[PDB]
Amino acid sequence: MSEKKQPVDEDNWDDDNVEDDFSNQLRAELEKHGYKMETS
Amino acid sequence: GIISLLDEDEPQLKEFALHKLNAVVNDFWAEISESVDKIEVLYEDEGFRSRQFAALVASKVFYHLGAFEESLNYALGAGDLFNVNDNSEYVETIIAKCIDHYTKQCVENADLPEGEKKPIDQRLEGIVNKMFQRCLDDHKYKQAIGIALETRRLDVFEKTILESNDVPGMLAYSLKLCMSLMQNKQFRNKVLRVLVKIYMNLEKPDFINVCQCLIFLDDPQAVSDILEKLVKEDNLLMAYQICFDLYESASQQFLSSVIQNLRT
Amino acid sequence: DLYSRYKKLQQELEFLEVQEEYIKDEQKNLKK
Amino acid sequence: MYEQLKGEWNRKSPNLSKCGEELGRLKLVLLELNFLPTTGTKLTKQQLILARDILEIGAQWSILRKDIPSFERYMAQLKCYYFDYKEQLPESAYMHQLLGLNLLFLLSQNRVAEFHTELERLPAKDIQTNVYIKHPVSLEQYLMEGSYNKVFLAKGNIPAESYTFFIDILLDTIRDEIAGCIEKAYEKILFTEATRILFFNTPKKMTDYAKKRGWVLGPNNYYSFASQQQKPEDTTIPSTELAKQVIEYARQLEMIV
Amino acid sequence: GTYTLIIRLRHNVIKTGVRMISLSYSRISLADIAQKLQLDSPEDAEFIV
């Protein structure tokens, strides 16, 4: 059983949705506020 | 790629096409399968040098599509170049069309051939008795006894009672077959009345089959006729089994009907 | 023989056809 | 060597009395040897390289007379000659600029599935080389999105050859395009912007579109007519189709099948 | 063996952009969306929309 005749060759999902929205945005969003204190 | 050259108006390019539409007909069968079907255009275009070959390659190409009536009408309209080849894997493809459609046509022609009869092609009936001569000439007669029933034709069956096969009891046990597999009365009595006249025109006239057929047939005079042939022959020992199979297996009303033809 | 091998074998197709219609009838008749 | 042709092919003989003897000359190629792959006698190519050059120039002058249906006859024969895996010319100065020219006219023929199918043909010739045939796939690629002025920049860059017969159908396919999608939520536009986006400043072609459709000639005005009110608010068509579908529920709900 | 299908995704990319921004903002200049979508051209920002 479980042969595959071969012609050719939680812990993760809510985290993965965090990656889905915040994939690469504001990773170290810690000092940008203190950088906007003088510009804003 | 030879699909492109179909706007030439020199028809010699079209016969160059059907030169390529027959021999390698399987790999571009994928290519032109449903796309272009201009066989009828040059097949009906009076630039003929392509008509009597044109319906052949259509009858090749539509086959694995199915289209058994398409390649069947083109099989009839394909002429001499079609049926000339039987050394292939294609004669089995076409007699399964034409012979089957012929005999299921001849079921209707056993129903009503008189009035609104169908335009039977002479090849549609011609490969029937041609392949039937292949049956008679290829030594097989347990089938040649059979296709003669399949065509629903009496006189070819009466014809092949005298063939390269003999009659020991051959063509007599075939009525033991046909009595078992017999469908109705209408086809039954027709063959039944015509075989038992050559049974009387046989060298040794069998009596039990001509009695059995006649009680299967309701002829209250022919048994008085061959009964007159056995009084004229004058042997009651052979005027015996014709008569006690008659008394045993006949009806009371049938004997009361045949009795006048006996006493007169 | 070979000639009876097809006619007597479609004979049980005619004989075969009626029975599913029969159990089709008894399928509702045993309910009602 | 049965050649008959080698004098008048390179000089322009525009639809003169070379075409009939040319087609019957190709018939004389056909009477000698089929345009078949000729896998046997590979050495012999008089039927392949010479007759292929004759058939590609015969494909070439077909566009000069606007012979649209017989163009793809010769051209389809050329593509089926590059179907031949035999060692010949891998390509020439014609295989790109003629095969993707067929892609460029089919790109206009408004058949995008047949436009994409051919991409098995040249997998490596797409972007990594062959800029002249990268130009039609990037071109129709720009016709996919709302890229419009960049298409006119590709009308500023026709690098391979003239491509005029195809960029004029590309003119017309812009004409009906924004002749159609001029009808959008375009609140009011003066006689400058939508005027000079396409082609026409002030001929009576603006009367041809402004009176063919609406957007009536006004006081520097493109009239935004927009009703979009009549066809909604139907329960009845849902009360017919949906009343059908409720019975279609109840069939496969109670009745045994 | 899929690069010729990968190459056509930018249509869907700009559909994602115009659906995202068109859903998000309500009254935005067309001389902002081309720069935020790095389109380099506000003259066809009317045209993609």
Added chain:
Amino acid sequence: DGQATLLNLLLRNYLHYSLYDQAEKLVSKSVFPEQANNNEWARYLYYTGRIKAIQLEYSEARRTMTNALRKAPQHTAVGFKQTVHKLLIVVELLLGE
């Protein structure tokens, strides 16, 4: 089973050398063998799934991509499942979802 395996094994380089032949597989009567032993049917729906994928019929493709995915066994050597796992959401990226 000559109805079945003779069409994937027909397909296997016709896809890799495909163009218009696909329409032949559209008009093919033998698309169905109606039973193909849970694996030839399964990869069969994939081999015809990439047909509609490459010839641009998207939404019809992705459902037989999914149906071709959900009919594969409980074995670990899964390179073709690596392929359909990729191509199955290639076309969904073509469809936005």
